[model samples]
Target: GTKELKLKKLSDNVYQHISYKRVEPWGLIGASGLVVINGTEAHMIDTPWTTQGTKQLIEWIEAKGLTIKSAVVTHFHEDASGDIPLLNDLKIKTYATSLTNKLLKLNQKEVSSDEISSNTFEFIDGVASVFYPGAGHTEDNIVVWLPNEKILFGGCFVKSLKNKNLGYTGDANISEWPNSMQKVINRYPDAKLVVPGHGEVGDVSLLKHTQALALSAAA
Candidate 1:
C-alpha cells in the first residue's frame, strides 16, 4: 500500500513501478507508473514522485541491463512530472502532450519535450500510444496505451476504484472528466491491464468506475 521506489512485474515486458509521496491528512501514498522493456530499451509512463526516487528507479532499471531512452509524462503534476529536470538533465527524451508541455513551466517545472498536440500520439510506433480524451483530472491530463499489450496507463485521470472519491481536485476539470473517461473506455475496449495514477492496478473496470464517479461528482 505504501513504498519508496520498487517495480513489480506484470508481464514479460511490463513492470509497474511505485513511488511514495506525502499527502496531507492522508499520510503517505504510493504513486504508480509503468515501465515497458523492449530488448535493452525501457520506456517510462510516468516518473517516480521525486527525482531522488526516480534516480533509484533508474539505477534499478539499469541494474537489469536496460537503459531508459524516453519517458511520457501524463500530466504536469509534481507526482507525474517532478523528475522532468532530472530526466532532461540526463538527456532522456521526455514526451508530454501539447497542453502538458504548456502547463509544465507554470507547474514549477521547465519543458523539455516537443509540443505534441494530438488526440493520439505514438511514442514508440505500435508499442506505446498516448490518448488525450479532452480534460479530466487535469486540463493536460493524458493516458498511455500499450497498444499491442492491451495495457492502459490511466495516470491521475482515472482513479482507482478503491477510493470512494477523487483524491485531489485542485487541478481538475470535473465537468469534462466524465466524457474523457468515456472516450478512453470506448477507445480501448479490449484493454486488459488498467494502471491508475496511484494505488493497485485493475482491469478496464477502473475506467468505468472513474466515469461513474465523475458522473455523480459532476451532477
Candidate 2:
C-alpha cells in the first residue's frame, strides 16, 4: 500500500510534500520537500524515500497536469536523495552541488553529473535558487530559496521548531553549522516561511532556533 502523501500550500506556485522514511538511529522520520509549479511544468527540491512514495508524489503532480521538469538535490543523504535513481528512471533531470557529487562518489554512493559549482544557482529561472551557505548537516548540504515568496527550504541545515537536539551529527560539521546558518539568515532576512528538512514549518525564528541549537551542540 502506498503511504498517504501530504501537501501544504506555501504560495500560489509552491507546495511542500511531507513524506516518511525509516532512518537508522532515528527510526522513521518525516521529511519535507518543495514543489514549484510554473505554467504546466513543476520542479522538486528533493524526493521521497521509497519508490512507492516517489511514484505517488509524481502521480499526484502529474494528475494536476504538470510535468516534473527536474529535481534539485539538497544534499547527499538518503532522506534527500533516496529517490534519485527512481527519478533518473523517470528521465527527470536532477541537479546537485559539485561538492555533493564529489562526496557521494567518495562515499561510494550514486553521483549526479549535473553538478553546479557555484555557491548559488537558479533551478527554475527566477523561481528557485539553490545556495550552499556553508556546511552544517553535511559538508554538502544546501538550501533552496524562493526569493519572490520569501521561503527557504533549509533542508537538514536548519532544524525545526520542535527539534531539541541537532538530530544526526554523524556527517555534520557542528562547529561550522552556526556560521552556515548565519549566512542563510543574513541572505534571507525577509523569509516569511521557513521549512526545515524534518519538522513543522515556521517563520524566521526557526533559523535563530537552529543556530542556537547548533551553538549549544558545538559547546
Candidate 3:
C-alpha cells in the first residue's frame, strides 16, 4: 500500500509536504513540513510521522532527481521527528536545536549523540535560517526562516486558522507562547508565506492568529 503524501508548491524553490497521522484528541490530523530545493540538492524541515511515510517522501524526492542533503527537526514530537531512526539508518544528516536534541534523548530512547545541535544557524550556506523563537508547543520547539523567500516554517509553535485551542499543551509553555510568537512576528515582518506545523499554509496573518490563540489560552 502506498502512503499518502501531497507536495504543494509554495514558491520557486519551496514546497509543502502534507501527510496524515492518527493523533489523540484530533483523530486523523494533517501534518506539514517544508522542502526547499536548491539546484540538485534539497533540505527538509521535518518528516512525516511514520517511517513508511518518511520513506515514501524520500523516494518521491529522489524520483525528482533531487537529494535531501539534510533534515532539520523542529521539535522532539513524533509528528516532527518520528523518522529519526529511518533517517539514521539511511545515513542522512539531521539537525535540531540543542534543547530539542536533549528532549528527544530523554523522551525517545532511539536518539543518538551524533545528531547535530545548535540554537541557530544557516542551513546549506544561506538556504535557510533555523531559530528557536522561545517556546510554545514545546520547550524545544523551533522555526525556520528563509529570508530570501520570506517564508517562515512555524512548526507546532504556530496554530492553523481553524485551530480553536492551542492544540496540545501538556508539553507547551502557554505563558511564553504568545511572547515567543511575537518574537517570530517581529523577526520576519515581511514574510509573504507562513507554514504552520500542520493544516493549511497561509501568510503573516497566521502568526497573528496563532498569537491570539495563545493569548486567549493564557488568559
Candidate 4:
C-alpha cells in the first residue's frame, strides 16, 4: 500500500477519496475512506493494511485537524478490519454491522478481535442515518447516507474505479448487489454524491452503472 492516500473535499464537510493502493496474492485491491464530521471529528470509513498504512491514515486525519471519533469497518473482511485493533488501542470506536459482527464472531480468521461495537447509523455529531442496501458485495454490506449533504458513502455495495471488474463473488451476492443498489437509489433519490467503498467517487448515475453490471453478472 502507498504510504499515504490522497483526499479530495467533495463539499465543505464531506470528503470523497481513497487511500494507498494495496495488492494481494488474489489480485485484490484495498483502500480506505474518510468522512469529516463538522470539521472537528472524522469518521473513517475503512482501514487499510494492518501495517503502517492504517497508522498513516490516522496521522493524515490528525494533520487535517480532525479527530477520528470512530472507524467504520465496511465489512468483515480482514483487509477492511485488520487495522481495527490498532485504532482500538488508540481508544477510537470501531463500528461494524450486525451481520458483520456475527460473521466475525463466527470466523476468527477474518476478524482477529471482537472489540468493535455494532452500529446501524452514521457516526455523525448531528442527525444522520446508516442504511443497508441489502446484500451487495457482501451479505453484511452497508452504506452511509448524509441526508443533509445528499452524500451517500456506499461501502462495498459498489466497486472502485481502479478495481473495475465484475463483482467479486467470493463474498458478493451477484444477484442481490444490483437490486440492493436500486433499493439504495430509491431510498436516496436526492443523493448528489455517490462514494463507493472502492473506486473513484461519482454522481447518482454511478448507481445505474453498478446496477447494470450486477444485472449483467447475473445474466
Which numbered prediction scores highest in lDDT against the true structure?
2
Clashing pairs in 4: 160-198, 160-199, 161-199
TM-scores for every candidate against the unseen true structure: 0.95, 0.94, 0.92, 0.82
What stretches of model 4 exceed 4 Å from their correct place? 1-3, 22-32, 109-122, 125-128, 160-164
RMSD versus native structure for model 2:
1.8
Tens-place lDDT per residue, model 3, 25-69, is 767667889889989998888888777778888998899999888
Q: Which parts of model 2 have CA positions greater than 4 angstroms off?
A: 1-4, 22-28
Worst 10 residues of 2 by lDDT: 1-10
Q: Rate the local accuracy (lDDT) of all candidates.
A: 0.86, 0.87, 0.83, 0.70
Compose the digit string of candidate 2's lDDT tens values, residues 1-55.
2344677888899999888777687776678999999899999898876666788
lDDT of 4 by residue, 123-203 (tens): 565634667768877888777777778887776677655455655578788988888888888888898878776667778
The global Cα lDDT (0 to 1) of model 4 is: 0.70
Candidate that beats the other on lDDT, 2 or 3, i.e. the better one: 2
Error at 55, model 3, angstroms = 0.8
Q: In model 4, how large is the Cα lDDT of residue 211?
A: 84
lDDT of 2: 0.87
TM-score of 4: 0.82
- Candidates 1 and 3 compared by TM-score, better number: 1
